[PDB]
Amino acid sequence: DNLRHFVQDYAVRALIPYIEHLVAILAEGVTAELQTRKLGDLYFMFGHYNLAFQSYHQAKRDFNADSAWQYYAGALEMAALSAFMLGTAQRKTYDYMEDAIVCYLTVCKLQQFATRATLLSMECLKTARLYSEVAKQLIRMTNEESDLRSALLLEQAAYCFLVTQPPMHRKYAFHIVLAGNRYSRAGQRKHAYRCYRQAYQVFQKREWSLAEDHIQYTVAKQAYMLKQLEEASRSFAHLLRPGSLQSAQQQTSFLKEYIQTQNELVKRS
Amino acid sequence: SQSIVALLFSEIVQYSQSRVFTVPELQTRLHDLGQDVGTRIIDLYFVRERSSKRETKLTQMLLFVKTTVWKNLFGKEAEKLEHANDDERTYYIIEKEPLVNTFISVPKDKGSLNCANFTAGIVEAVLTNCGFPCKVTAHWHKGTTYMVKFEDFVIARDKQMEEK
Amino acid sequence: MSTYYFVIVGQNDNPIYEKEFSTVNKELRKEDHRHLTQFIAHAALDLVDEHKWKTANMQLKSIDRFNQWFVSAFITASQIRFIIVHDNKNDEGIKNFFNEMYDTYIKNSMNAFYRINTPIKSPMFEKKSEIFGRKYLLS
């Protein structure tokens, strides 16, 4: 009840003395490189605005050496954090941030660094409306690092690529179903299912039933057991084998579609 | 020759008049035929005159079309190309020589528009295939003129390009 | 070698006509790759829109990449898009090879029977495609 916020306000305004103690501790610290980055990120928990820039600078200079570049990587992303409390944000620093991923990706194969580096890129460029860049570097990320992480990152990068402009859903659609397979493979069901649904809706928005027909044969395999049959039935019906140049397996497939629509007709009649 | 083309085109016009029961969509047929001819006129005259060179500047492409299409179709390039400052979507190309009245035409009492619309449809097809979709209307203003109305999308792309 | 494959993207963005120039193999998988490359034709379409707004020339060397394929895009006064997917580029000849198929497409243009984005059906253009592909790309 009220006691929580009472102790909360008192503890916050006693931590202001505590953060002052830590400021004294770091002013003592300036008098190792790991000590420097501990200094940085500790006062970044309450986020020093310019000491951000000086930690940025010092970390860059020294961690040119000491080729364990998590120091320097984390340094420039906390420089991006500074850019959040920096109106100019020296927007080329964002370019620096892009730099951050591509080289440091290769520096260490601990992919999580690449992940949240790209995520900070995502958010900060969303603070610039120019999502195109992070769209491209997220799509160049998502091919790799997994077949599962590849999938949810495929849709992340995908909808993000669509964040800048509504149309050109094309490669969006392609890789999001070519990852919806992996979604059915190793993903929590609600996210994979929202994959399938949003992908299919994006299909219908600008129809192009050619590859949608085979992905709707997949809709059917999840409809021959779980989903509704009529959607697959009408999907194959609009393909309409003669004049659509279907193939031997496709004719057999629409035989099976006749089987499913037979189930549907029998259940209706 | 001139008599053969002038006549034969006249039979296009009047056979449309046969299949058409009124003025306006008769003029629409004339527009459609102008389109169906310009749809290749464009990329024929591209190579032989524009030296196979694209003109992203609406002014430059429009001026060059003004020179070329009229130079080869009807000999004399149209007199003047103008842009209206009030509406950047709407410009004018005035051609004092009537290409309809080259074959001296019908009394415009029972009708209003003529082969002017056909060449207007030619212009419109050229525009829409040059990447500048537009509406081209034949107008008996200061004699023969073609009013061109640019899509706000197209003129917007142009204005953004006209931010050097 | 490069599995050259040509595709047409129309004025109204609908695809028109393809032409393989690849060696003979993996044709069942090549059907799926043909679906893929029609999708790549759309993706090209999208990118080459702004990229041709960047320039004013006929040829835009190569735009899209898929870790094995290269995408080469040709824009015309007809605002058609002529696209090649190919593992290793051959651009130096295909500039004027696109120019020659351009001239042939003009020949089809004078055929008023062929019309706006009206899909190719003439044997003349098909045999021209065959001879030209055996000339440079399929070779």
**DSSP codes of every residue in A253-268:** HHHHHHHHHHHHHHHH
Q: Which residues pair with C4 in a beta bridge?
A: C21
Does C103 contact chain B (CB < 8 Å)? yes
Angle at A222 between CA A220 and CA A227, to 5 degrees: 85
* DSSP-assigned letter for residue B136: E
Of C31, C35, C43, the CB nearest to A171: C43
Give Cβ neighbours of residue A131 (< 8 Å, ≥ 6 apart).
A122, A125, A160, A161, A163, A164
Angle at B84 between CA B79 and CA B86, to 5 degrees: 170
Q: For residue A182, what is the enclosing H or E element? A: helix A170-186
Does B161 contact chain C (CB < 8 Å)? yes
CA distance A100 to A75: 10
A94-108 CB burial, b ≥16 within 10 A, e <16: bebbbebbeebbeee
Q: What is the 3-state secondary structure (H, E, C) of chain C?
A: CCCEEEEEECCCCCEEEEEEECCCCCHHHHHHHHHHHHHHHHHHHHHHHHHHHHCCCCEECCCCECCCCEEEEEECCCCCEEEEEECCCCCCCHHHHHHHHHHHHHHHHHCCCCCCCCCCCCHHHHHHHHHHHHHCCCC
CA distance B71 to B78: 8
Residue A46's CB: how many other CB atoms inside 10 A? 11
Q: Side-chain half-sphere of C24: how many Cα atoms within 13 Å?
A: 0
Residues of B with Cβ-Cβ distance to C75 under 8 angstroms: 54
User: Would you give the end-to-end CA distance of chain C in angstroms?
Assistant: 9
Which of C9, C50, C53 best tests the B interface by mutation, with the highest count of B CBs <10 A?
A: C53
Give which of A137, A184, A170 is closest to A156, Cα–Cα.
Answer: A137
CA distance A192 to A195: 5
- Our measurement of the distance from residue A159's CA atom to the centroid of its chain's CA atoms, rounded to an integer in Å, reads 9
CA distance A44 to A77: 12
B–C interface: beta-carbon pairs under 8 A: 45
Q: How would you class C21 by CB atoms within 10 Å of its CB: exposed for 0-12, middle for 13-18, buried for 19 or more?
A: buried
Instruction: Give the closest-approach CA distance of B122 to chain C in angstroms.
Output: 14
Which 3 state secondary structure label does DSSP give B87?
Answer: coil
CA distance A167 to B153: 15
Contact C72, C83 (CB under 8 A): yes
Which of C52, C57, C78, C82 best tests the B interface by mutation, with the highest count of B CBs <10 A?
A: C78
Residue C88's CB: how many other CB atoms inside 10 A? 10
Does B42 contact chain C (CB < 8 Å)? yes
Q: For residue B92, what is the enclosing H or E element? A: strand B90-94
Instruction: Give the closest-approach CA distance of B45 to chain C in angstroms.
Output: 10
Contact B57, B143 (CB under 8 A): no
- The chain C residue lying nearest A211, using CA atoms, is C35
Structure tokens at B3: 């008599």
Does B76 contact chain C (CB < 8 Å)? no
Instruction: Give the closest-approach CA distance of B55 to chain C in angstroms.
Output: 6
Contact B132, B55 (CB under 8 A): no
CA distance A185 to A193: 12
Of C57, C106, C109, the CB nearest to B54: C57
CA distance A161 to A264: 39
B103-118 CB burial, b ≥16 within 10 A, e <16: bebeeeeeeebbbbbb
Give Cβ neighbours of residue B21 (< 8 Å, ≥ 6 apart).
none
Instruction: Give the closest-approach CA distance of C13 to chain B in angstroms.
Output: 13
Which 3 state secondary structure label does DSSP give B127?
Answer: helix
Of A143, A170, A247, the CB nearest to C43: A170
- Our measurement of the distance from residue A49's CA atom to the centroid of its chain's CA atoms, rounded to an integer in Å, reads 28
Q: How far is CA C114 from each of CA B40, B47, C106, rounded to the nearest angstrom?
A: 10, 20, 10
Instruction: Give the closest-approach CA distance of C36 to chain B in angstroms.
Output: 27
Residues of A with Cβ-Cβ distance to C38 under 8 angstroms: 210-211
Of A143, A167, A170, the CB nearest to C39: A170
Identify residue B159 by its one-letter amino acid code.
Answer: K
Q: Which residues pair with B135 in a beta bridge?
A: B149
CA distance B74 to A216: 56
CA distance A47 to C72: 48
Q: How would you class C7 by CB atoms within 10 Å of its CB: exposed for 0-12, middle for 13-18, buried for 19 or more?
A: buried
User: DSSP secondary structure string, A92-130?
Assistant: HHHHHHHHHHHHHHHH---HHHHHHHHHHHHHHHHTTT-
* DSSP-assigned letter for residue B106: -
What is the total count of domains within chain B?
1
Identify residue A200 by its one-letter amino acid code.
Answer: Y
CA distance C45 to C9: 7
Give Cβ neighbours of residue B97 (< 8 Å, ≥ 6 apart).
B74, B76, B78, B144
Q: Which residues pair with C19 in a beta bridge?
A: C6
* DSSP-assigned letter for residue A57: H
Q: What is the 3-state secondary structure (H, E, C) of B44-81?
A: HHHHHHHCCCCCCCHHHHHHHHHHHHHHHHCCCCCCEE
User: Would you give the end-to-end CA distance of chain B in angstroms?
Assistant: 48
Which 3 state secondary structure label does DSSP give A169?
Answer: coil
Residue A176's CB: how many other CB atoms inside 10 A? 24
Q: How would you class C109 by CB atoms within 10 Å of its CB: exposed for 0-12, middle for 13-18, buried for 19 or more?
A: middle
Does B162 contact chain C (CB < 8 Å)? no
Structure tokens at A215: 């992905």
User: Would you give the end-to-end CA distance of chain A in angstroms?
Assistant: 61
Does C106 contact chain B (CB < 8 Å)? yes
Give Cβ neighbours of residue B114 (< 8 Å, ≥ 6 apart).
B13, B30, B100, B105, B106, B108, B138
Give which of B99, B144, B110, B98 is closest to B17, Cα–Cα.
Answer: B110
C43–A211 CB contact, under 8 Å: no
CA distance A3 to A24: 31
CA distance A59 to A69: 10
Identify residue B123 by its one-letter amino acid code.
Answer: V
Angle at A67 between CA A66 and CA A70, to 5 degrees: 100
User: Dihedral, CA atoms, C90, C92, C98, C100, nearest 10 degrees?
Assistant: -120
Per the rule left: phi > 0, alpha: psi between -120 and 50, beta: everything else, B51 is: left
Per the rule left: phi > 0, alpha: psi between -120 and 50, beta: everything else, C26 is: left
* DSSP-assigned letter for residue A69: T
Does C39 contact chain A (CB < 8 Å)? yes
A and C touching (3 or more beta-carbon pairs closer than 8 Å)? yes
Q: Order the strands of the C4-9 sheet from edge to edge.
A: C15-21, C4-9, C81-86, C70-75, C59-60
Which 3 state secondary structure label does DSSP give A66?
Answer: coil
Q: Which residues pair with B108 in a beta bridge?
A: none
Contact A149, A121 (CB under 8 A): no
Which of B33, B52, B53 best tests the C interface by mutation, with the highest count of C CBs <10 A?
A: B52
CA distance A194 to B128: 40
Of C31, C46, C67, the CB nearest to A170: C46
Of A167, A171, A211, the CB nearest to C35: A211
CA distance B137 to A190: 56
Per the rule left: phi > 0, alpha: psi between -120 and 50, beta: everything else, A227 is: beta
Q: For residue B120, what is the enclosing H or E element? A: helix B115-129
Instruction: Give the closest-approach CA distance of A64 to chain C in angstroms.
Output: 32
Match 């669509």 to its residue by tokens.
A162
Structure tokens at A223: 């409809």
Per the rule left: phi > 0, alpha: psi between -120 and 50, beta: everything else, A138 is: alpha
- The chain C residue lying nearest B60, using CA atoms, is C56
Structure tokens at A220: 């059917």
Residue C24's CB: how many other CB atoms inside 10 A? 7
Q: What is the 3-state secondary structure (H, E, C) of A191-240?
A: HHHHHHHHHHHHHHHCCCHHHHHHHHHHHHHCCCCCCCHHHHHHHHHHHC
CA distance A126 to A120: 10
Instruction: Give the closest-approach CA distance of A151 to chain C in angstroms.
Output: 16
CA distance B105 to B17: 14
Of C39, C43, C46, the CB nearest to A211: C39
* DSSP-assigned letter for residue A89: T
Q: For residue A269, what is the enclosing H or E element? A: none
Match 């909808």 to its residue by tokens.
A159
Residues of A with Cβ-Cβ distance to C67 under 8 angstroms: 143
- The chain A residue lying nearest C65, using CA atoms, is A140
Identify residue B66 by its one-letter amino acid code.
Answer: K
**Structural domain boundaries, residue B3:** 1-164
Give which of C35, C16, C119, C13 is closest to A213, Cα–Cα.
Answer: C35
